[PDB]
Amino acid sequence: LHIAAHYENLNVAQLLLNRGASVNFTPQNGITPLHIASRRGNVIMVRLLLDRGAQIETKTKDELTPLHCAARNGHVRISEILLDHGAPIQAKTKNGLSPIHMAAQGDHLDCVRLLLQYDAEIDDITLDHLTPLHVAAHCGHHRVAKVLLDKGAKPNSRALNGFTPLHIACKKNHVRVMELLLKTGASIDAVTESGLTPLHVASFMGHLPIVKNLLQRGASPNVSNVKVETPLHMAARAGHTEVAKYLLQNKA
Amino acid sequence: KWWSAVVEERDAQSWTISVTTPADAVIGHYSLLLQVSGRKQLLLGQFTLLFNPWNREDAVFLKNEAQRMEYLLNQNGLIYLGTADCIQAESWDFGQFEGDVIDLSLRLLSKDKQVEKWSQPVHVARVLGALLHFLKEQRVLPTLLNKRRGSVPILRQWLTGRGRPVYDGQAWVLAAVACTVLRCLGIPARVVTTFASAQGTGGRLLIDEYYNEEGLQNGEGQRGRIWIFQTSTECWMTRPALPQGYDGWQILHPSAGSCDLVPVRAVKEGTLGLTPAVSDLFAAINASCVVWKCCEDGTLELTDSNTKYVGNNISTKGVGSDRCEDITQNYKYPEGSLQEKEVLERVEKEKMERESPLYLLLKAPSSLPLRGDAQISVTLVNHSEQEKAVQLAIGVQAVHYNGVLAAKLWRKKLHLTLSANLEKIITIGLFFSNFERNPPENTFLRLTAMATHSESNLSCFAQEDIAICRPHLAIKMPEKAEQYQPLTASVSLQNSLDAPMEDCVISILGRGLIHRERSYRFRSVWPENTMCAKFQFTPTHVGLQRLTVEVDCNMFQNLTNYKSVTVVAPELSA
Amino acid sequence: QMEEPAAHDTEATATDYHTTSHPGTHKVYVELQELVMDEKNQELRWMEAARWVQLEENLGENGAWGRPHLSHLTFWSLLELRRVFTKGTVLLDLQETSLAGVANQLLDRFIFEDQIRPQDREELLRALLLKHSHAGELEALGGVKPAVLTRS
Amino acid sequence: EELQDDYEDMMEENLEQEEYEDPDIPESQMEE
């Protein structure tokens, strides 16, 4: 039945279920046929398994529900079918990931839209206190970030180490996420627990466009860390000559 | 697995015969003949053979049943138009299972004389794409005029010369027509819209845009332009003649001619050389825009402009819904990421081997209501120690979807002084009533801002594309409906314009709901009033049907909205 | 619950529904059916009255088909036929495979052309979907008299 | 070819058990 669900072989799946196959057979890894059909985007298999009594809330070894598998691969119709059958939209994995986190991780815009329409928590946090906006900033998905910010996600959410989505976008050279966050009221001078500004992070990583845009929008280059360390200190330490040159040409 | 026949059931007077065809059979019209020894050939009948996405061994095999119905069986499609920040979904009747479409497609394919290659989906798709592009070039006229009824009447007009011709304002229908033909022949296909597409570069990653000192463009445009949107046909098949790993979605890219099938993965990874058209498709969604200021003296000065991103919000209809699916991640890596950096560097290396104190920030709404009102914000920051005397030029121009300018609408000239190291925000009202002329239909607004200061020789520039928002056509209909029973749909329209709606026509259609279409006249709607109108019709076809409503008036034309209804078979009785 | 729009005569889109397929050459069989009533149950039904294969055959009040003959027409027959065809409602290339599907689409088009009132649709739909009996059942039905449809 | 999917190792690779696990939540700490 697991193989039939993987390949969406409807006929042999119906035969197996009519000959007494367990629609809810959980192996040691916890991967039921419903998990497989939801992961593979097999809409008709998902409907068949749900009709034969597949459980909607079964967790894998890492506590993934079928909705987690559907949202991870951006299967909107499957996610809607599971939600209409009672799948918990706020179920969490071992790392505290809700399905909206999985959909944001995969740049699955329409899955994020559908989850938000079904009352998913837009500011749900993982164990590392990562919001879906944090995930979208980490992966560089500016479209997901636009959908989240337009729906009211907090642009200044703090992770465990005090990182905002702006900090994470500046770390990973995601300039579109950066402009989107700064367009929707993200603090350009927010500091982490270590006192790192977005300019600090960008100067340490050597992302020239981020540094240029941050200084053009009015970020002070003379901010200091917990140790008295300016962005010019970070640029010198990492040997980013161009970033340091643009800093020195500015008011650093 | 080849041609074969076996008798399954038999009485004394008849044989029930099961006939197979090979998974790589030549498609088209077939004659079936029976040879009995001591007897001459007898024609049993005629049948048409098609590609089979349901068969594992077929080159067009689709893994998912839902994908099979969406990409081959669904005749009710959605073509996404508008801008990247305001996407408008227009209901489109692919109509690939209309009675004459299969004959028209096979007759068009008969122009290719390599009939032995008709068993190959790649060859059939290539030939049909080239022929349909040639027909589009021959039949689409230079610029109701834009009223559309799906791909089938367009195909009929292109093939026979009879019917309503399509005009160049809707040249994007080529993708939908190609999708219809491919779906009718059994090749799974979908229409893909790419917003901000850099067309006509010839593989170059640079786009030159030219603006005068008012922030407006004089000439009709360059050869290389960033189109507001471009449609394309994607088709699903294996690629036996390519290196392993390129099975899946293929882009049909005609070249002025001949057509090429490009795997989407090749575009994403910058595999320039796998097919001849990889370079052009890659440049369409990876080019960088360079803005030039055209002075009255004749100097062509370089401009400090905002980054104009290309290849945005690559969109197609979702599987099993009327929702919009974003597939940009199939075509590009995230901006500023490591993988995008590697792909860009490799492409630059291949092409090379083969061959300021002011900062402007422009905020605009994604859409401007028709005859409506909007606010735009210009942020100017001074990085100099001296206060700056700056001339801010604001320009609004009408542009067609293919980047060709239509009409200069508005211009504004501000003269401002900023204190040293002081941000200043200038809010400007963008009003329809201020336009020197009404924008042409199916055009978009090119908003520009140009800040020039003293004699620094460099000017700050920003641009945005603004869609025109029309009043929402609200359709209220039950989600489910019983076959052969009356079903009522109510349509609401709020007149948010500054003038009455006159000569008001409402048209309803939909396959399996209404035979052809019915056009009605409703009363004139004064400003801030609401049209409410009900239509009674009986669905006669079981399944997921779609009702399409179109409203025309003196203020706007071809305003279309849709709503889906599931028609169920009547309850079993005696 | 406010407004019902009025039908607009418009042919700007009529050519978009014109098929390119040449129809086949087919011989025609014609059957004429009349709305009638039976002795046994007083139930309204459609009854075979005449058929055209090569000539015209008419069904008598015995259950037996009459002598084949050439189809003569009355002068008034062609006069009123032209009048009703001038204002007639035509559904061409109608995609229907059931009588109920045909009848519903025809009655909807009847209302759109203002040929019938919206109050007449239910009575006409009930009439068109009555039982369609044939000549063999005439003897078993206890006979047939002509009948007239009434709004009741 | 055309029969590799009949073997347990190839079927295991096709079913992709790693796609049903929570891989990691990477932080990539800036300091060292």
Curated annotation (Swiss-Prot), chain A:
- The molecule here is called Ankyrin-1
Residues recorded as bearing (3S)-3-hydroxyasparagine in the entry: N24, N222
Included stretch of the parent chain: 210 to 461 of 1881
Taxonomic source organism: Homo sapiens (Human)
Mark the ANK repeats by their residue spans: 1-25, 29-58, 62-91, 95-124, 128-157, 161-190, 194-223, 227-252
Give the signal peptide, or none.
none
**Which residue positions does Phosphoserine occur at?**
S220
> What PTM annotation applies here?
Regulated by phosphorylation. Palmitoylated.
Classify the source by domain of life.
Eukaryota
Gene label: ANK1
The task this protein performs is described as: Component of the ankyrin-1 complex, a multiprotein complex involved in the stability and shape of the erythrocyte membrane. Attaches integral membrane proteins to cytoskeletal elements; binds to the erythrocyte membrane protein band 4.2, to Na-K ATPase, to the lymphocyte membrane protein GP85, and to the cytoskeletal proteins fodrin, tubulin, vimentin and desmin. Erythrocyte ankyrins also link spectrin (beta chain) to the cytoplasmic domain of the erythrocytes anion exchange protein; they retain most or all of these binding functions.
- Give the record's subunit note: Component of the ankyrin-1 complex in the erythrocyte, composed of ANK1, RHCE, RHAG, SLC4A1, EPB42, GYPA, GYPB and AQP1. Interacts with a number of integral membrane proteins and cytoskeletal proteins. Interacts (via N-terminus) with SPTB/spectrin (beta chain). Also interacts with TTN/titin. Isoform Mu17 interacts with OBSCN isoform 3/obscurin. Interacts with HIF1AN. Interacts (via ANK 1-5 repeats) with RHCE; this interaction mediates the primary membrane attachment site for ANK1. Interacts (via ANK 1-2 repeats) with AQP1 (via the N-terminal). Interacts (via ANK 1-13 repeats) with EPB42.
From Swiss-Prot, chain B:
Task: List the Gene Ontology MF annotations in alphabetical order.
Answer: ATP binding; protein-glutamine gamma-glutamyltransferase activity; structural constituent of cytoskeleton
Regarding the membrane, this protein is recorded as: Lipid-anchor
Q: Name one GO biological process term.
A: multicellular organismal-level iron ion homeostasis
Q: List the subcellular locations.
A: Cell membrane; Cytoplasm, Cytoskeleton
Q: Which UniProt keywords apply?
A: Cell membrane, Cell shape, Cytoplasm, Cytoskeleton, Disease variant, Erythrocyte maturation, Hereditary hemolytic anemia, Lipoprotein, Membrane, Myristate, Phosphoprotein
Q: Which Pfam families match?
A: Transglut_C, Transglut_core, Transglut_N
Q: Which PROSITE patterns has this protein been placed in?
A: TRANSGLUTAMINASES (PS00547)
Major localization class:
membrane
Task: Please give the InterPro entries that the UniProt record associates with this protein.
Answer: Ig-like_fold (IPR013783), Ig_E-set (IPR014756), Papain-like_cys_pep_sf (IPR038765), Transglutaminase (IPR050779), Transglutaminase-like (IPR002931), Transglutaminase-like_sf (IPR036985), Transglutaminase_animal (IPR023608), Transglutaminase_AS (IPR013808)
Q: Which GO terms describe its cellular component?
A: ankyrin-1 complex; cortical cytoskeleton; cytoskeleton; plasma membrane
How does it get modified after it is made?
A: Both cAMP-dependent kinase (CAPK) and another kinase present in the red-blood cells seem to be able to phosphorylate EPB42.
**Disorder this protein is connected to according to its UniProt record:** Spherocytosis 5: Spherocytosis is a hematologic disorder leading to chronic hemolytic anemia and characterized by numerous abnormally shaped erythrocytes which are generally spheroidal. Absence of band 4.2 associated with spur or target erythrocytes has also been reported.
Subunit structure, as described in the record: Component of the ankyrin-1 complex in the erythrocyte, composed of ANK1, RHCE, RHAG, SLC4A1, EPB42, GYPA, GYPB and AQP1. Interacts with SLC4A1 (via the cytoplasmic domain); this interaction is mediated by the SLC4A1 Band 3-I dimer. Interacts with ANK1 (via ANK 1-13 repeats). Interacts with AQP1 (via the C-terminal).
**The family this protein is said to belong to:** Belongs to the transglutaminase superfamily. Transglutaminase family.
Output the PANTHER family linked to this UniProt entry: PROTEIN 4.2, PROTEIN-GLUTAMINE GAMMA-GLUTAMYLTRANSFERASE
The molecule here is called: Protein 4.2
Please name the source species: Homo sapiens
Gene encoding the protein:
EPB42
UniProtKB/Swiss-Prot annotation, chain C:
Phosphotyrosine PTM sites in chain numbering: Y17
Signal sequence region: none
Q: How is it modified after translation?
A: N-glycosylated.
Q: In which tissues is it expressed?
A: Detected in erythrocytes (at protein level).
Q: Where in the cell is it found?
A: Cell membrane; Basolateral cell membrane
Effect of substituting G101R: In SPH4; Fukoka
Give, from the UniProt record, the effect of changing K27E.
In Di(a)/Memphis-II antigen
Residues covered by region (Interaction with ANK1): 147-152
The task this protein performs is described as: Functions both as a transporter that mediates electroneutral anion exchange across the cell membrane and as a structural protein. Component of the ankyrin-1 complex of the erythrocyte membrane; required for normal flexibility and stability of the erythrocyte membrane and for normal erythrocyte shape via the interactions of its cytoplasmic domain with cytoskeletal proteins, glycolytic enzymes, and hemoglobin. Functions as a transporter that mediates the 1:1 exchange of inorganic anions across the erythrocyte membrane.
* Family listed: Belongs to the anion exchanger (TC 2.A.31) family.
- Give the linked disease: Ovalocytosis, Southeast Asian: An autosomal dominant hematologic disorder characterized by ovalocytic erythrocytes that are rigid and exhibit reduced expression of many erythrocyte antigens. Clinical manifestations include mild hemolysis, intermittent jaundice and gallstones. However, the disorder is most often asymptomatic.
Name the chain's protein: Band 3 anion transport protein
Q: Which organism is it from?
A: Homo sapiens
Measured against the full-length protein, the chain present covers 30 to 181 of 911
